[PDB]
Design a protein around this ligand. Structure first.
Ligand SMILES: C=C1/C(=C\C=C2/CCC[C@]3(C)[C@@H]([C@H](C)CCCC(C)(C)O)CC[C@@H]23)C[C@@H](O)C[C@@H]1O
Length: 255
């Protein structure tokens, strides 16, 4: 059961990704008061008609997602090797992974205390009912919550969390990529860093089959991505939806 030590290069990769995350994820959520304000209409019955008529939480959650895409673009640019890719492949990778990295990075605000993403006072505590007030349905939200709990229970080290986000972004099997072999080389360098880290720095029993569990979460994210895309397309049919979104969100998710 060999445990090769992390190379100097692998240690540098981990330090770079930790720094990149610390520069692009504010764990105080202090910018969120700058977004359009959250509004919660009375919708205890979960009425799709009402939810679509009002889309009360959409401006705020679209601003949150847009902000988060900006942060993910910045994080990606600091992944070792990402800037070796052509501009065209960088943009394909960013647009295809954005929602997945948002789901991953949001695990840091997710809490099993009450199954919410807690980003401050009540105003910035996001629950499943807030996501339905932004026009989404249970076929996305239920698996998303299940995903957040499963990821929580892996008890990832921050090193592993940031490696997982980087591996998600640098995926050679995204539609439209040109230099799949270069993307795969970059991804393999990150994957080998992660496997090596787990084996020499993650104590048992949480280390047991941990790499395989993390790779499974990447597959789960693909399913969530596809369901989000389907639901976004239907949300976009609502008259005046575009004004509730942002230009960046429209580009990343638009048809
Ligand atoms: C974003 C981040 C956070 C929460 C993410 C959540 C909670 C609200 C609902 C979200 C945003 C899900 C929604 C299904 C996304 C719908 C987007 C849209 C309306 C455009 O189709 C995905 C992840 C969710 C907060 C913080 O962790 C930063 C992070 O970065």
């Amino acid at each position: 059961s060999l445990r090769p030590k992390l190379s100097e290069e692998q240690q540098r990769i981990i330090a770079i990704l930790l720094d990149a995350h610390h520069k692009t994820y504010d764990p105080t959520y202090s910018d969120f008061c700058q977004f359009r304000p959250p509004v919660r209409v009375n919708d205890g019955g979960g009425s799709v008609t009402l939810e679509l008529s009002q889309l009360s939480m959409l401006p705020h959650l679209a601003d949150l997602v847009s902000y988060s895409i900006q942060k993910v673009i910045g994080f990606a640019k600091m992944i070792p090797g990402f800037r070796d890719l052509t501009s065209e492949d960088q943009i394909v990778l960013l647009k295809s992974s954005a929602i997945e990295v948002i789901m991953l990075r949001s695990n840091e605000s997710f809490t099993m205390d009450d199954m919410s993403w807690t980003c401050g006072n009540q105003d910035y505590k996001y629950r499943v009912s807030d996501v339905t007030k932004a026009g989404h349905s249970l076929e996305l939200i239920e698996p998303l919550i299940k995903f957040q709990v499963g990821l929580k229970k892996l008890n990832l080290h921050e090193e592993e969390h940031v490696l997982l986000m980087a591996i998600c972004i640098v995926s050679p099997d995204r539609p439209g990529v040109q230099d799949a072999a270069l993307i795969e080389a970059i991804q393999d360098r990150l994957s080998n860093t992660l496997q090596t880290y787990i084996r020499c720095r993650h104590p048992p029993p949480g280390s047991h089959l941990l790499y395989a569990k993390m790779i499974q979460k990447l597959a789960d994210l693909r399913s969530l991505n596809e369901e989000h895309s389907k639901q976004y397309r239907c949300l976009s049919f609502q008259p005046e939806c575009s004004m509730k979104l942002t230009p960046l969100v429209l580009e990343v998710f638009g048809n």
